Amino acid sequence: MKALTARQQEVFDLIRDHISQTGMPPTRAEIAQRLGFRSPNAAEEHLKALARKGVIEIVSGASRGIRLLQEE
Secondary structure (H helix, E strand, O other): OOOOOHHHHHHHHHHHHHHHHHOOOOOHHHHHHHHOOOOHHHHHHHHHHHHHHOOEEEOOOOOOOEEEOOOO
């Protein structure tokens, strides 16, 4: 249906893993630090590619604010 590339699928798996442990979605600092990104704008660009294909809503304003929608 809508296929995800390997490093954007690592960003999507950290969103599902923090909801399964805590209830809530992660910050853009947790996505850059826990997966291992040298520039935090590369973690933000893979998060934008997940919203542009159609799998998440980025709630722009809330720090822990990424709502899980679709995969397939």
